[PDB]
Amino acid sequence: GVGISTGTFNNQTEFKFLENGWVEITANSSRLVHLNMPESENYRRVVVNNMDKTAVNGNMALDDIHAQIVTPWSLVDANAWGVWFNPGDWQLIVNTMSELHLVSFEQEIFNVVLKTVSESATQPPTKVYNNDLTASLMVALDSNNTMPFTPAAMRSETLGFYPWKPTIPTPWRYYFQWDRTLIPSHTGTSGTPTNIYHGTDPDDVQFYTIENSVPVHLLRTGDEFATGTFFFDCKPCRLTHTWQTNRALGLPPFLNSLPQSEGATNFGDIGVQQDKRRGVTQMGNTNYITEATIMRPAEVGYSAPYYSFEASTQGPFKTPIAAGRGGAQTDENQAADGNPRYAFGRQHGQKTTTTGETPERFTYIAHQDTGRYPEGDWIQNINFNLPVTNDNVLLPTDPIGGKTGINYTNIFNTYGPLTALNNVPPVYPNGQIWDKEFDTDLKPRLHVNAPFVCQNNCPGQLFVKVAPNLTNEYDPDASANMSRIVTYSDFWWKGKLVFKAKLRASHTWNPIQQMSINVDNQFNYVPSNIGGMKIVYEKSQLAPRKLY
Amino acid sequence: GVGISTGTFNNQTEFKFLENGWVEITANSSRLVHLNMPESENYRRVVVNNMDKTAVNGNMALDDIHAQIVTPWSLVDANAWGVWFNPGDWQLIVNTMSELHLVSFEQEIFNVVLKTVSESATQPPTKVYNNDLTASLMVALDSNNTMPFTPAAMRSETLGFYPWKPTIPTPWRYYFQWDRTLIPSHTGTSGTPTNIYHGTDPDDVQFYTIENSVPVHLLRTGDEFATGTFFFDCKPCRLTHTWQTNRALGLPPFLNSLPQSEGATNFGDIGVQQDKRRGVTQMGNTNYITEATIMRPAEVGYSAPYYSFEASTQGPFKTPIAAGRGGAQTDENQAADGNPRYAFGRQHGQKTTTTGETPERFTYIAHQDTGRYPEGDWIQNINFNLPVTNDNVLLPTDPIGGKTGINYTNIFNTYGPLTALNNVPPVYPNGQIWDKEFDTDLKPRLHVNAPFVCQNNCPGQLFVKVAPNLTNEYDPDASANMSRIVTYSDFWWKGKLVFKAKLRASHTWNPIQQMSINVDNQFNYVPSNIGGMKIVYEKSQLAPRKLY
Amino acid sequence: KAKLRASHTWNPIQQMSINVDNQFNYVPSNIGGMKIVYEKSQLAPRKLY
């Protein structure tokens, strides 16, 4: 009814321990969503063109030319870790569990309130907000996944992370087809390369509308819309990292001489010469069996061509890399490729009382040792004389193509049938939870943006829009814009995400690295005297696991 | 209730494939309709008289004198192709099906909103729109077809073609009886012909009101009106055209000499003289058997007197022609008679962001070869000497009545008992879907405006009107106009039209002409950067069919 | 065994058709010379993601 509520606020996460060390995690989340009427009631087709920026030779990485369809609908997106967990629940899950399953997902909309602004133009020009009890909110649930899938976590435009703060939805848009061609150059190149935007191929035109595809529900004040329960079928995401490289697989060599005194410089020693040892190598012309030459079962990780831009029908793009380097060799100073860098605003983890429009940034360096250190690689000739000569090695200090800043590791690629690698780790709080698999014949082995991939079907997207509120003067045969009453809405969203985890067990004599609070990160978890909150990122794969 | 919705937006078309190659097409359509209170609450009887225009000799085709009854009700009319299908569904139906049945039709009205304008006269004179929760909307459904049938597609006044755009209904009116007499003339005629409007015959006066004929429902905000399901009984409309003329029926002549080399000028030849052949003719005094003389089973198409104005009790009108010419001989330059010409506005297919009040026009040239080429006809004497003499042929260059611009084909008529012809094709998007059969004793064989004719009964018309909102001062004994509160309405219309089609089959070695998108008509199906949309017309009978 | 396609967008789809250019590739000549010109097979688009 008019003065009857249709739902209940709930933002609790529960832990229900089953038998055999399985625990059912059910995270609830509720928000207050503020929605304005759209700027235009029509679908647009806008072409973005920053050709003045890439007209300077060398700046071809800054390309932004694309085409998109601007729709009057808005999207409610809750596909991020920080929507469902606070740092206490995340510390509990990360420290106590070993693997994670994704079970189900629901959402609903209740307690709709529509108000109209009537700006009484005084000399202090005021505005009185009145309830419009007969206005409607239009809600479309794309359960068959007919619309193009747009995850909002990649643009940092999901729901907010604080339960006591009102949030906004994202204006929806999708990509339209275009053709462009950009020839690269460098600073000090004679002439201008081709920088051409061709247009649209008629064989690839797809124009989607919400009205022709999805049934749209009209919600007044006493109405309530509830999505049913979707059920996932996914692979488990493991909360442990591996440390073993190719240099630490299998049986170590037997030491015939052990140290007799304590110290960091009392080393052990194999008492056999390198040309008198036993074991298997893969060098048919070499009697040396060392730690770098001994045969391993497979290879962990691979080398990829890093900072490689590939061009296609719609312009250049960067090549994605599955796992980057990180650990004792690389810091914030030592720049690497493969580690993602997140940017976000005050709604998603930045300090709420900060000044300026510069976002907050961090680079996520994972714990799994599956990367490569490109400054220590080399090729050598198959003759394999051990004091190697100048013209028999390919070093990373040798120029490729005459360019002194390019070596062979920039174009190297060692992916093969012996390559083993790991899935991507979850990133709290800004990371995505699930993702959709590509509708192609040969599917990729992993995604670099989400730990779960719903294979057959994913949860349908939820669209929302304020219904048009017309005035007395309205002529559809006139070419001008539709004149509407200034209306906005407030509704309550409530979701429920259910997981399933397994409690970890101790295997070693020594303790394990855990997530804790100390004197350094103390004031990152409490509000300030004004109420400024923030959410700093936390690691997810803390405990180690033996690979082999 | 007040804050409870009473319906659901739906604008999807479904395809449900049955057995034996039959598919059930169910098109849904929903709109938002904007309705003002009427200008006057009374019925009027207005006589239109453009006698100053036809006072000039020669302009008697521009007659507009009639009489009509102006009612305060409005009509909701959804009898057009573009209300139910988008160009994708139309391409699917036209390319894949062969015939079309019309099954059922429903409509309903829900989510009524009534608002009053109270213009607070400030120096920036504003107006505040307030909900009137106790106001009513009057809805009359003429299910027995008592009112005169007025199809709105002939004046381009149906509902809009875009689902995301609000639409308006049409103010209802019907024809009243009058008598007029106009004698034609030409430029340079001595004197003035009779141009007289007589008046009304008392034997033919019919004054219809909605209140005395139809039960009227009163709808407040929580109310919902739903028409039941009407069921059609109609002949099927075929989506294939015929190409065979009278010159291509039956067995061709046997060729005694075939060409020996390829080329466009290596012709075949019948090796028999024209006075030595066999076969049946219909010339009792002629031994020549040629392709023009050989007997055919019947005649396809007919000749009609074209641009012939007939006069009757109520003035002159044009004579309708069933099928006009079109193809290799006629273009937009070569003007023809019989092909319809549509005019329409921004609500019905014109570019929405265009300027001016000039409508958009197109001439629909069909594919069926059932017309006539009047420049190639001739009569000749029954003596039939084959090099024909000057005074033995009637040519289209010979003047009829001494007039050099008139030949005998303007007054010719060859309709007979041997005439075969085809039904009218559907015109997307502006064409009518169904039509009512005349309530006369001898009914016409076809209509030139709709492919379906509901014979016994048709769907009843839906009338709508805002109920009167009186003020405190109201005196019915005073001769002045009723003073009302300025009120308008917004309601949602939702219809459901069900068809039945049969999937086509391939019969020939060669492919068939289809409807496709290419580089010419590419930007006719996508919005612009402002949101300007348009709907260009598409052909409906694409595949050929053998007549005999 | 095939599955009939469905319409998803507002705009039409590119189809295979006969026109004035490829007209005489599907009929025999006056001597009987026939030919078969190649045709494309993946005409309609599909969203990848």
mmCIF file of C-alpha atoms in Angstrom, chain A residues 1-2 41-45 132-134 136 138 176 200-202 205 207 209 211-216 218-223 468-474 476-477 479 482 485, chain B residues 2-5 8-9 11-12 32 34 36 86 110-113 115 117 127 129 131 133 164-166 168 221 346-347 352 354 488 490 517-519 522-523 526-529 531:
data_model
loop_
_atom_site.group_PDB
_atom_site.id
_atom_site.type_symbol
_atom_site.label_atom_id
_atom_site.label_comp_id
_atom_site.label_asym_id
_atom_site.label_seq_id
_atom_site.Cartn_x
_atom_site.Cartn_y
_atom_site.Cartn_z
ATOM 1 C CA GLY A 1 0.000 0.000 0.000
ATOM 2 C CA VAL A 2 0.874 3.690 0.209
ATOM 3 C CA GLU A 41 14.636 10.063 -23.602
ATOM 4 C CA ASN A 42 16.196 8.928 -26.888
ATOM 5 C CA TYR A 43 18.931 6.519 -27.887
ATOM 6 C CA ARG A 44 22.001 8.222 -29.331
ATOM 7 C CA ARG A 45 24.919 7.042 -31.467
ATOM 8 C CA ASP A 132 4.004 12.008 -6.677
ATOM 9 C CA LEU A 133 2.021 8.975 -5.558
ATOM 10 C CA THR A 134 0.981 7.985 -9.082
ATOM 11 C CA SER A 136 6.146 4.956 -11.806
ATOM 12 C CA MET A 138 10.445 1.149 -14.802
ATOM 13 C CA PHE A 176 28.800 0.126 -31.569
ATOM 14 C CA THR A 200 30.769 1.413 -39.827
ATOM 15 C CA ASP A 201 30.636 -1.939 -41.588
ATOM 16 C CA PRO A 202 27.008 -2.762 -42.499
ATOM 17 C CA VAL A 205 25.508 -3.373 -37.150
ATOM 18 C CA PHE A 207 21.252 -1.859 -32.335
ATOM 19 C CA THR A 209 16.821 -1.574 -27.186
ATOM 20 C CA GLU A 211 11.870 -2.238 -24.752
ATOM 21 C CA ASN A 212 11.922 -4.718 -27.631
ATOM 22 C CA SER A 213 13.974 -7.308 -25.721
ATOM 23 C CA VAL A 214 13.052 -7.318 -22.016
ATOM 24 C CA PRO A 215 9.636 -7.246 -20.286
ATOM 25 C CA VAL A 216 9.495 -4.017 -18.283
ATOM 26 C CA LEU A 218 6.151 -0.591 -13.707
ATOM 27 C CA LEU A 219 6.563 0.043 -9.980
ATOM 28 C CA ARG A 220 4.582 2.541 -7.944
ATOM 29 C CA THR A 221 5.077 3.279 -4.250
ATOM 30 C CA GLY A 222 3.422 0.120 -2.935
ATOM 31 C CA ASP A 223 5.171 -2.141 -5.431
ATOM 32 C CA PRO A 468 8.172 9.858 -18.314
ATOM 33 C CA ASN A 469 6.157 12.573 -16.564
ATOM 34 C CA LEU A 470 4.629 14.794 -19.214
ATOM 35 C CA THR A 471 3.072 18.240 -18.952
ATOM 36 C CA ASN A 472 -0.126 19.540 -20.544
ATOM 37 C CA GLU A 473 1.669 20.860 -23.627
ATOM 38 C CA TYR A 474 2.993 17.908 -25.621
ATOM 39 C CA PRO A 476 4.806 14.527 -30.873
ATOM 40 C CA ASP A 477 4.811 16.007 -34.390
ATOM 41 C CA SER A 479 10.827 18.356 -33.704
ATOM 42 C CA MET A 482 10.011 16.490 -24.871
ATOM 43 C CA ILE A 485 8.401 17.415 -14.978
ATOM 44 C CA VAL B 2 -3.553 4.349 -5.390
ATOM 45 C CA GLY B 3 0.075 3.252 -5.159
ATOM 46 C CA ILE B 4 -0.317 -0.128 -6.874
ATOM 47 C CA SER B 5 0.424 -0.737 -10.546
ATOM 48 C CA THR B 8 3.203 -4.648 -17.269
ATOM 49 C CA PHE B 9 4.985 -3.079 -20.238
ATOM 50 C CA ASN B 11 6.805 -4.885 -26.567
ATOM 51 C CA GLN B 12 8.297 -8.234 -27.616
ATOM 52 C CA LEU B 32 2.302 5.760 -23.300
ATOM 53 C CA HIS B 34 -1.084 11.568 -23.615
ATOM 54 C CA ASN B 36 -5.945 16.416 -23.017
ATOM 55 C CA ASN B 86 10.336 -3.356 -36.140
ATOM 56 C CA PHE B 110 -3.718 0.486 -17.298
ATOM 57 C CA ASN B 111 -1.852 2.865 -14.954
ATOM 58 C CA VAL B 112 -4.080 5.897 -15.404
ATOM 59 C CA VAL B 113 -2.710 9.221 -14.142
ATOM 60 C CA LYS B 115 -3.193 15.775 -13.343
ATOM 61 C CA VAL B 117 -2.669 22.460 -14.218
ATOM 62 C CA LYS B 127 2.313 26.308 -13.470
ATOM 63 C CA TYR B 129 0.952 20.172 -11.768
ATOM 64 C CA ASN B 131 -2.408 14.870 -8.889
ATOM 65 C CA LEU B 133 -6.781 11.319 -7.263
ATOM 66 C CA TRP B 164 10.128 4.611 -26.310
ATOM 67 C CA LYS B 165 8.207 7.713 -27.428
ATOM 68 C CA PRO B 166 4.897 9.010 -26.008
ATOM 69 C CA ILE B 168 -1.382 10.960 -28.730
ATOM 70 C CA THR B 221 -6.114 5.782 -10.785
ATOM 71 C CA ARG B 346 7.521 12.581 -37.649
ATOM 72 C CA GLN B 347 5.483 10.199 -35.500
ATOM 73 C CA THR B 352 12.395 13.075 -35.977
ATOM 74 C CA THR B 354 13.897 17.333 -39.355
ATOM 75 C CA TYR B 488 -5.035 16.095 -18.769
ATOM 76 C CA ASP B 490 -1.560 9.822 -19.108
ATOM 77 C CA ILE B 517 21.190 -4.218 -45.292
ATOM 78 C CA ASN B 518 24.007 -2.651 -47.306
ATOM 79 C CA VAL B 519 26.098 0.505 -47.551
ATOM 80 C CA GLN B 522 22.928 1.541 -43.601
ATOM 81 C CA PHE B 523 22.098 4.647 -41.570
ATOM 82 C CA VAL B 526 20.300 3.379 -36.443
ATOM 83 C CA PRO B 527 19.717 6.606 -34.474
ATOM 84 C CA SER B 528 21.792 9.701 -35.033
ATOM 85 C CA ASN B 529 23.882 11.544 -32.464
ATOM 86 C CA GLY B 531 18.454 10.638 -31.413
#
